[PDB]
Amino acid sequence: MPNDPNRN
Protein backbone atom coordinates (compact mmCIF):
# COMPACT_ATOMS: atom_id res chain seq x y z
CA MET A 1 0.00 0.00 0.00
CA PRO A 2 1.36 3.40 -1.06
CA ASN A 3 1.21 6.38 1.29
CA ASP A 4 -1.02 8.51 -0.97
CA PRO A 5 -4.75 7.62 -0.89
CA ASN A 6 -5.61 10.23 -3.57
CA ARG A 7 -6.16 9.86 -7.31
CA ASN A 8 -2.93 10.23 -9.32
Epitope: M1, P2, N3, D4, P5, N6, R7
Partner: antibody, heavy 120, light 113 residues
Framework: QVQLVESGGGVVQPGRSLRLSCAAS????????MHWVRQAPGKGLEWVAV????????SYIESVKGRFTISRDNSKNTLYLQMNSLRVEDTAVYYC?????????????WGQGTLVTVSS | DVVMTQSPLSLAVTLGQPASISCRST???????????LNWFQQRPGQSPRRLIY???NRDSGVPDRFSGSESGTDFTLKISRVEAEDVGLYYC?????????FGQGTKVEIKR
Amino acid sequence: QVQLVESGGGVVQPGRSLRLSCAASGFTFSSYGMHWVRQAPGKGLEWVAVIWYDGSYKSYIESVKGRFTISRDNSKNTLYLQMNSLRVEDTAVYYCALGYSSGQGTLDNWGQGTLVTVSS
Amino acid sequence: DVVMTQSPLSLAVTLGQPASISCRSTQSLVYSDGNTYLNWFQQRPGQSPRRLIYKVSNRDSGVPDRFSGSESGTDFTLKISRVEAEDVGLYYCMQGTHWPWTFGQGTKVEIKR
Protein backbone atom coordinates in the same frame (compact mmCIF):
# COMPACT_ATOMS: atom_id res chain seq x y z
CA GLN B 1 -13.55 26.48 0.31
CA VAL B 2 -12.69 22.90 1.29
CA GLN B 3 -15.17 22.07 4.05
CA LEU B 4 -15.67 18.95 6.16
CA VAL B 5 -18.38 18.74 8.81
CA GLU B 6 -18.54 15.75 11.14
CA SER B 7 -21.77 14.65 12.77
CA GLY B 8 -23.17 11.78 14.80
CA GLY B 9 -21.40 12.08 18.14
CA GLY B 10 -23.20 11.83 21.44
CA VAL B 11 -23.66 9.65 24.48
CA VAL B 12 -23.49 5.91 23.75
CA GLN B 13 -23.52 3.06 26.24
CA PRO B 14 -20.42 0.83 26.33
CA GLY B 15 -20.94 -2.07 23.94
CA ARG B 16 -23.51 -0.27 21.78
CA SER B 17 -22.89 1.21 18.34
CA LEU B 18 -22.67 4.60 16.69
CA ARG B 19 -22.31 5.76 13.08
CA LEU B 20 -20.29 8.93 12.55
CA SER B 21 -20.67 10.86 9.30
CA CYS B 22 -18.53 13.58 7.78
CA ALA B 23 -19.99 15.85 5.10
CA ALA B 24 -17.58 17.17 2.47
CA SER B 25 -18.00 20.02 0.00
CA GLY B 26 -16.13 22.59 -2.08
CA PHE B 27 -13.83 20.08 -3.81
CA THR B 28 -14.03 16.96 -5.96
CA PHE B 29 -14.57 14.58 -3.05
CA SER B 30 -14.16 11.32 -5.04
CA SER B 31 -10.49 12.10 -5.89
CA TYR B 32 -9.21 12.27 -2.28
CA GLY B 33 -8.57 9.63 0.33
CA MET B 34 -10.19 10.26 3.71
CA HIS B 35 -8.91 9.76 7.25
CA TRP B 36 -10.33 9.54 10.77
CA VAL B 37 -8.26 10.97 13.64
CA ARG B 38 -9.49 11.07 17.22
CA GLN B 39 -8.42 12.92 20.36
CA ALA B 40 -9.44 11.79 23.84
CA PRO B 41 -10.29 14.82 26.01
CA GLY B 42 -7.05 16.43 27.13
CA LYS B 43 -4.94 13.74 25.43
CA GLY B 44 -3.09 13.61 22.09
CA LEU B 45 -4.07 13.14 18.45
CA GLU B 46 -4.31 9.55 17.27
CA TRP B 47 -4.75 8.48 13.66
CA VAL B 48 -7.47 5.80 13.37
CA ALA B 49 -8.21 4.78 9.77
CA VAL B 50 -7.99 5.71 6.08
CA ILE B 51 -10.04 4.85 2.98
CA TRP B 52 -8.89 5.22 -0.63
CA TYR B 53 -10.44 7.76 -2.97
CA ASP B 54 -12.44 5.01 -4.74
CA GLY B 55 -13.00 2.96 -1.56
CA SER B 56 -10.72 0.07 -2.56
CA TYR B 57 -8.02 0.03 0.13
CA LYS B 58 -8.74 0.58 3.84
CA SER B 59 -6.47 0.54 6.88
CA TYR B 60 -7.06 0.65 10.62
CA ILE B 61 -5.30 0.91 13.92
CA GLU B 62 -5.10 -2.51 15.58
CA SER B 63 -7.03 -1.25 18.63
CA VAL B 64 -10.17 -0.74 16.50
CA LYS B 65 -9.82 -3.54 13.93
CA GLY B 66 -12.90 -5.77 14.00
CA ARG B 67 -15.06 -3.08 15.68
CA PHE B 68 -14.76 -0.02 13.40
CA THR B 69 -15.49 0.09 9.68
CA ILE B 70 -14.59 3.09 7.52
CA SER B 71 -16.66 3.59 4.37
CA ARG B 72 -17.78 6.35 2.04
CA ASP B 73 -20.44 7.19 -0.52
CA ASN B 74 -18.90 9.18 -3.36
CA SER B 75 -22.34 9.90 -4.83
CA LYS B 76 -23.21 11.71 -1.56
CA ASN B 77 -19.84 13.36 -0.76
CA THR B 78 -19.97 11.66 2.62
CA LEU B 79 -17.50 9.83 4.87
CA TYR B 80 -18.62 7.27 7.44
CA LEU B 81 -17.18 5.57 10.51
CA GLN B 82 -19.26 2.69 11.87
CA MET B 83 -18.27 2.01 15.48
CA ASN B 84 -19.35 -1.21 17.18
CA SER B 85 -18.53 -2.66 20.60
CA LEU B 86 -17.62 0.81 21.84
CA ARG B 87 -15.34 0.94 24.88
CA VAL B 88 -14.82 3.77 27.37
CA GLU B 89 -11.35 4.24 25.85
CA ASP B 90 -13.05 5.16 22.56
CA THR B 91 -14.28 8.41 24.15
CA ALA B 92 -12.85 11.25 22.05
CA VAL B 93 -13.41 13.99 19.50
CA TYR B 94 -13.39 12.38 16.05
CA TYR B 95 -12.10 14.46 13.12
CA CYS B 96 -12.25 13.67 9.44
CA ALA B 97 -9.18 14.84 7.54
CA LEU B 98 -7.63 14.80 4.07
CA GLY B 99 -4.57 15.94 2.16
CA TYR B 100 -5.71 18.39 -0.53
CA SER B 101 -2.75 19.98 -2.35
CA SER B 102 -1.03 16.65 -1.83
CA GLY B 103 -2.32 13.59 0.00
CA GLN B 104 0.98 11.75 0.12
CA GLY B 105 2.14 11.29 3.71
CA THR B 106 0.42 14.42 5.04
CA LEU B 107 -2.85 15.99 6.19
CA ASP B 108 -3.86 19.60 5.56
CA ASN B 109 -7.67 19.91 5.97
CA TRP B 110 -9.72 18.99 9.02
CA GLY B 111 -13.30 19.13 10.20
CA GLN B 112 -14.30 20.75 13.45
CA GLY B 113 -14.81 17.30 15.07
CA THR B 114 -17.68 15.53 16.79
CA LEU B 115 -17.52 14.40 20.43
CA VAL B 116 -18.29 10.74 21.20
CA THR B 117 -18.90 10.04 24.93
CA VAL B 118 -18.92 6.33 25.85
CA SER B 119 -20.74 6.39 29.19
CA SER B 120 -23.68 4.69 30.91
CA ASP C 1 3.50 0.69 14.48
CA VAL C 2 5.98 3.54 14.16
CA VAL C 3 6.37 5.19 17.55
CA MET C 4 6.86 8.96 17.47
CA THR C 5 8.41 10.14 20.76
CA GLN C 6 8.37 13.90 21.38
CA SER C 7 10.39 15.94 23.84
CA PRO C 8 9.81 17.93 25.88
CA LEU C 9 6.16 17.20 26.64
CA SER C 10 5.87 20.72 28.12
CA LEU C 11 8.08 23.70 27.24
CA ALA C 12 8.07 27.11 28.94
CA VAL C 13 9.99 29.92 27.25
CA THR C 14 10.07 33.69 27.70
CA LEU C 15 8.80 35.97 24.92
CA GLY C 16 11.31 36.64 22.16
CA GLN C 17 13.43 33.65 23.13
CA PRO C 18 13.93 30.65 20.86
CA ALA C 19 12.22 27.31 21.43
CA SER C 20 12.54 23.91 19.79
CA ILE C 21 10.54 20.67 19.87
CA SER C 22 12.11 17.34 18.91
CA CYS C 23 10.60 14.12 17.57
CA ARG C 24 12.28 10.70 17.32
CA SER C 25 11.27 7.68 15.26
CA THR C 26 11.66 3.96 15.95
CA GLN C 27 11.99 3.38 12.16
CA SER C 28 13.33 5.27 9.17
CA LEU C 29 10.77 7.57 7.60
CA VAL C 30 12.53 7.68 4.23
CA TYR C 31 9.95 6.54 1.67
CA SER C 32 10.76 4.72 -1.54
CA ASP C 33 10.54 8.05 -3.40
CA GLY C 34 13.41 9.47 -1.28
CA ASN C 35 11.32 11.87 0.80
CA THR C 36 10.92 11.87 4.58
CA TYR C 37 7.21 12.30 5.46
CA LEU C 38 7.56 14.05 8.81
CA ASN C 39 4.89 16.67 9.61
CA TRP C 40 4.43 19.28 12.35
CA PHE C 41 1.01 20.48 13.51
CA GLN C 42 -0.05 23.35 15.78
CA GLN C 43 -3.34 23.09 17.73
CA ARG C 44 -4.96 25.85 19.79
CA PRO C 45 -7.54 25.03 22.48
CA GLY C 46 -10.82 24.00 20.88
CA GLN C 47 -9.48 24.11 17.34
CA SER C 48 -8.70 21.61 14.64
CA PRO C 49 -4.97 21.04 14.04
CA ARG C 50 -3.13 23.27 11.56
CA ARG C 51 -0.14 21.98 9.60
CA LEU C 52 3.08 23.98 9.97
CA ILE C 53 5.74 21.82 8.30
CA TYR C 54 5.60 18.94 5.84
CA LYS C 55 8.44 16.71 4.65
CA VAL C 56 10.70 17.80 7.53
CA SER C 57 11.31 21.42 6.54
CA ASN C 58 8.74 22.81 4.08
CA ARG C 59 6.77 25.57 5.80
CA ASP C 60 3.07 25.82 5.01
CA SER C 61 1.85 28.85 3.09
CA GLY C 62 0.62 31.46 5.53
CA VAL C 63 2.76 30.05 8.35
CA PRO C 64 5.11 32.78 9.69
CA ASP C 65 8.81 32.44 8.96
CA ARG C 66 9.91 32.18 12.60
CA PHE C 67 8.93 28.49 12.20
CA SER C 68 11.46 26.09 10.69
CA GLY C 69 12.06 22.36 10.55
CA SER C 70 15.20 20.27 10.26
CA GLU C 71 16.62 16.79 10.75
CA SER C 72 19.70 15.55 12.62
CA GLY C 73 19.37 11.86 11.81
CA THR C 74 19.17 11.47 15.59
CA ASP C 75 15.81 13.27 15.41
CA PHE C 76 13.56 15.85 13.77
CA THR C 77 13.22 19.34 15.19
CA LEU C 78 10.59 22.06 14.97
CA LYS C 79 12.10 25.46 15.76
CA ILE C 80 10.48 28.76 16.67
CA SER C 81 13.23 31.37 16.39
CA ARG C 82 11.54 34.10 18.49
CA VAL C 83 8.63 32.89 20.62
CA GLU C 84 5.52 35.10 20.39
CA ALA C 85 2.47 35.22 22.64
CA GLU C 86 0.14 33.72 20.00
CA ASP C 87 2.28 30.55 19.94
CA VAL C 88 0.70 29.01 23.05
CA GLY C 89 -0.84 25.66 22.33
CA LEU C 90 0.01 22.08 21.50
CA TYR C 91 2.41 20.89 18.81
CA TYR C 92 2.49 17.41 17.31
CA CYS C 93 4.72 15.57 14.87
CA MET C 94 3.29 13.03 12.44
CA GLN C 95 4.88 10.46 10.19
CA GLY C 96 2.98 9.47 7.05
CA THR C 97 5.56 7.03 5.62
CA HIS C 98 4.24 3.86 7.25
CA TRP C 99 0.63 2.75 7.87
CA PRO C 100 -0.73 3.30 10.42
CA TRP C 101 0.18 6.97 10.37
CA THR C 102 1.17 8.05 13.88
CA PHE C 103 1.56 11.23 15.94
CA GLY C 104 3.84 12.01 18.83
CA GLN C 105 2.38 12.54 22.31
CA GLY C 106 2.38 16.33 21.84
CA THR C 107 4.19 19.33 23.34
CA LYS C 108 2.59 22.20 25.23
CA VAL C 109 4.14 25.65 24.83
CA GLU C 110 3.72 28.10 27.72
CA ILE C 111 4.91 31.71 27.52
CA LYS C 112 7.05 32.98 30.40
CA ARG C 113 6.10 36.62 30.95
